Structure formats: C-alpha cells, structure tokens
Amino acid sequence: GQYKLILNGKTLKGETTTEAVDAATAEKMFKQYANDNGVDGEWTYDDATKTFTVTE
Numbered sequence: 001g002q003y004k005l006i007l008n009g010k011t012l013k014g015e016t017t018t019e020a021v022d023a024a025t026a027e028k029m030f031k032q033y034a035n036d037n038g039v040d041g042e043w044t045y046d047d048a049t050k051t052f053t054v055t056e
Helices: 022-034
Strands: 002-008 011-021 040-047 051-054
Touching: 002 022, 011 022, 022 040, 022 051
Parallel strands: 002 051
Antiparallel strands: 002 011, 040 051
C-alpha cells in the first residue's frame, strides 16, 4: 500500500510517499530516510490515513 511521510523538521519540510507491504516496513524506510537527512524528531503514525509524521 501507499504510505506517506510528513517531514516537519527544522530545516527539512515536506511530504514523500512510498509503496510498502505494511506499516512496519514503511516505518523502517522512513526512519532511515529521516536519519540520513539529519532529522531527529518525534514520530506519529495514523493507520486510518497511512501517514507518518516526524517533527523537530
């Protein structure tokens, strides 16, 4: 399914989407992406909208 990440960092903001087999897989991919881009924030996941957020 399609999962969305809302990036709400101090210096990196926006949205990205990926296909992933499940939310756990999307989470791993999005956390790795956030880490690689210097984002250190708090996370949420909403299963109704398939949306993750990371906020600094």
